[PDB]
Symmetry: D2
Amino acid sequence: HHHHMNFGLGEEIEALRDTVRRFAESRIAPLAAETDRNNQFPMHLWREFGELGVLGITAPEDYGGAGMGYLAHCIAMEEISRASASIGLSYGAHSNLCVNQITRNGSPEQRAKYLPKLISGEHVGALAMSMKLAAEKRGDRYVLNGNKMWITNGPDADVLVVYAKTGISAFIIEKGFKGFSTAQKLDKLGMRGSNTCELVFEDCEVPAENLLGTEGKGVNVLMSGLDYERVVLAGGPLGIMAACLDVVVPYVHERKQFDQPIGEFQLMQCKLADMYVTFNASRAYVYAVAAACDRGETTRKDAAGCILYSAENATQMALQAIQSLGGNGDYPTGRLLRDAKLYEIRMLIGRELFQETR
Amino acid sequence: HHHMNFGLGEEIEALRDTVRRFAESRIAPLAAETDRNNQFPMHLWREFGELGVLGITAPEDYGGAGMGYLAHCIAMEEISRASASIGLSYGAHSNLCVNQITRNGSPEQRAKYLPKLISGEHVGALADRYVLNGNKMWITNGPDADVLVVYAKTSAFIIEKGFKGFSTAQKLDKLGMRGSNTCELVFEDCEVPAENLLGTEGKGVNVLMSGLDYERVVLAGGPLGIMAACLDVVVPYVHEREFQLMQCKLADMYVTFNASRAYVYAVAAACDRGETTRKDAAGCILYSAENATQMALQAIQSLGGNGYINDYPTGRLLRDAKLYEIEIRRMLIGRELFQETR
Amino acid sequence: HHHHMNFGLGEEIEALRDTVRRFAESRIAPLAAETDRNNQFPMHLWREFGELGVLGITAPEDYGGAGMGYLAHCIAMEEISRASASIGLSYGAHSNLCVNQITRNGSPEQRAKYLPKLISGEHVGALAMKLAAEKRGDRYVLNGNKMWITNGPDADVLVVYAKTGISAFIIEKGFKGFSTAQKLDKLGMRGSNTCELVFEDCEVPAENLLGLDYERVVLAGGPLGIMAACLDVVVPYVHERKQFDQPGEFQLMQCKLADMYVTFNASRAYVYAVAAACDRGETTRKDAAGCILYSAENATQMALQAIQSLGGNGYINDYPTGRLLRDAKLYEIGAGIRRMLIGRELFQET
Amino acid sequence: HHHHMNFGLGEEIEALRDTVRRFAESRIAPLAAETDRNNQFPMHLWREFGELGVLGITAPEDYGGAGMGYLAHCIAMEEISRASASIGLSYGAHSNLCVNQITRNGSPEQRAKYLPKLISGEHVGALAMSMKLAAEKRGDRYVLNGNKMWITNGPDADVLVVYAKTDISAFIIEKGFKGFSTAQKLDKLGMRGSNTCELVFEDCEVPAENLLGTEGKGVNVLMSGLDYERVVLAGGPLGIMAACLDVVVPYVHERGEFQLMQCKLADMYVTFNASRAYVYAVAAACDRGETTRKDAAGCILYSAENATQMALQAIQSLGGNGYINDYPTGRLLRDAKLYEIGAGTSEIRRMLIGRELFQETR
Ligand SMILES: [Ca+2]
């Protein structure tokens, strides 16, 4: 494969990329198709992810994390999603949405208690941001009622970060908590095998020690990670685009023959060029925004920008891959398009830009 | 506030600011007049020289800045932001001519030609004795060039304006990039000394190909500057004129602009690392050029009726942007990707 | 539904559209999901299509046909495909690909024999456009195979092309040497029975020797129907999404509606125009290919947009937006390189 | 030229098309480049247009009109714009915006007075939609104050249909009316040679006999023409797309690159005839008397955006030559852009369609 431009990100990130790629190719790619058809996450991967050392990329090394940044995590997300977008999505919700939320907003006691098992992979994590859920203080404990829809890793999550109205607070939920239950997992068009379901809270008793950050200050807790976390998830669309090229490039080689129609080769090369450029332009944009996050710089418009841009590019590139293979497309290109659409599912960028320039 | 920060380091951030301040005060006021008169303001050459931007990638030993292509691209960007025409002329001089002599010239050739080119006393262009006959069309800075790098079949040559047999035709009347002097080069029994042969005889294809990449990357700053100029106009205008659809249009301009910058900067940085590659060079100029043209149309659209008046610069931005687009880039990228993945 | 522009096509065509639309709504749409799920054509529809009088739209009235044109047939195809693209494809292969070929290229004896049962729906028809035929006195001997044939497993009558340079034949299910393979389980167009045709020393009488663009234009009704189905889903949804807590989202949704509306009706205008040109007998080679390519691609993008507009609700495998995408994709595959043919025609003509 | 699909529109419309095409080829096309360069309308064309009988396409024959429909007029607009987009725009503002408004909303006396000279080309007409202009009844006369911007044929117009506020009302204005004046004509990016300027009203005295339709019901007069205006003027983008093909197809002949050019040619051909199909259909609907508010906006929106993008492709196909002012590709791009701006922007057009579609399905 030679459709990846080098961004000179340093030996450590390039080693991370290569490590994840070899793992994904041997342990993820062979079960990608079966995962989509059966609509089931292969649960054995969680412990393997842990031993690979990728479930806590941006988590402190004191809890078993790698102590790396969002650029590194985005690329780990990319290479995993490249083999399977569904598994990539589940991985992202765990290692980025859940773990990094506890990492950033958790008390020292909360980090020491919940992070080690999440980073090792013995526990699966989830995040329920988006009010359908209300929390009520009752002396020593909190009482939660309401629901949360469309939660990745919902059915399997042992630890869940959940937002509820008090005006907003965040809580750490354990699977074993009384009053907490999960409904039947969704049967989706794409991202099949990424277990998604409804969370149900009926008089759920949550200890005060499980309150995440300050009470009434949940929106800033939401806002805190959301920009940085959303950038990591842009690795999903990046991975799908990589997968598109993984299919098309060898296909163009197999199809280059004397019996090939007079002009189909040159048109295929032009299609390849557009895919190549779109892929690496998206990477450039996302990586830059991720690197800006690592520098601690505000990236609100560009974070949203790079996710929007890359998500749409992935969808259109998947369609171009299907178009390019024609009749012959057995191939996973159908899955790539279906998967891409979920990430795609502007005024915020424009509104903030307008208000900043007043 | 439509510029994302890419953390490019203190020296490059200092260069950008230096070039920006010069462009705003010394270039921008003359932008409209340059397009109208279809004439380059010749006084800028010495001012560019004194600014120290005509030899960005040239060695400090010849008066150059000794910086890289990322720095040069950004200088190109900020200049083109004030005037795309002048930016184009600047790029042809500082990159097409100067960097070619820098890379492929013998120590004596550099010592002879670079100092005056970097100072701005000479204008540069890119197209026992040697006799060159024939012609070259569409040469930027052609009518004014004192020193010219020219490719011929035997090879690359250094041509001086005073050489017998060398002449220039009437400058072009273009849709855009007006004031960027472009003309035909004419060679009729032109006598060129053997000492003016550039690099090795028969190895001119490697010389030509080498510079093309750096050209595509540095000149990609052109479209970047034009897109910046689009935002420079539209953002204050929408305030003077909140609606939901306009904010979406603004968002697209903003995102496209910074995505283009990200790609171009990365390729430029790759060149500085020596990881230079043909398809990504071709890729980022192709990408940014197409984006610039479409954004110019959107800039015109955003100003409405006023955007369609020659008083406002949006009309010029569209006309300027189209030249950078002027199949070959996509076929080069596809062919290159194919052969690497065989 | 108010996303259909009126093209003033006349009382007879408008009556056809309304009749087929009412039939599709009552008899096709309710089984659309089950048809896709089970990958089986509901065989009872053939006789119902027959009694409706739509299996011989371009067939002579003397054999039970409607005696109408390709514009009319395209629109019947559209309204059926609107309810189910799979059923539309099967209907198109029968009433258009098979019947109209026999109508146009069949001898009077061949028409009187094969058309009546096809038009009534008692017989199912198919077209097979790797196969060799050899003249041997009174009979023809066919050997080879034909892949990806719609209505293949159920076809009683098949129009088949073979190499000699090329000739067409009318094949009966009962012909010795003729057999059909297991039907395909495809990603989309599920419930449109498709299979391989197999010819091993197949004996065909000389009396069954027979004698595409116009027919290809009618099939553009498929994508048109799919786009119509996209709007059928999206327009009521935007109403449901219009709420008190909403949201800048409403205005953007309406703009999205406008684009879908324009794309849909522009596609119809182009396809209908080419269809009408076919009825006039005017050469339409580049324009036939143009409108099929254009509408097919538009259908796929609109299916993606329909998924986009419904959000989470659109992303469940239960909903028909998933089906629209799968169906649309097959039409774009079958209509494709296509552009180079058109350009070549324009260049060589000039 | 073999890049036109035939729509079987009948002998009368085909006869009109051929007549206008042959005229445009001989009398308009040679003057296109010079018209753009000088930023001046060739005034001799008005009388020539008149004798050709195309200034009153949808006007009654009793006033010298052709008594034809909007489909015919759209095609006249197309073939003229094909030779010169600037001249096409001026022609459209005169023959459609002004003349058809007087035809539809004028009293018998108003039609008998103003139409003959407009249709003959002796008078130039204009329409001023866009409030900024106020009118006050003073017995026998009206007194107008305010201004109207961006008026095609403004500097040259002898007769102008103007909309004003009463608390909206429409009026027929003559150049000689006291208080009426015009500012210096615009220096535009494109449509150069289509004279555009500001109208200025300073105590402009207008007779009561020049009031168009009913007072206070000017919005209905305005909305009425806008629909028909968008459809006929859609011939502009159609003509520009036709002009793109007129340039590119012969050029590729004179010149693995060949295969890519053919694919580009195909896209241009398909986009062109798809646009025609849509616009012609909406025009035919207008002739049937079938109101099509969203479809009128729809077909102009569609064709205008297609024309601009095709112009960019035309420039690209000619390469270096396409970027030279000698060649017409530069002008086509500059001209096409106005239609995306004019007669309401693309934004207003999409929202008009969406809003209308939403309320019908309520
Ligand atoms: Ca009949």
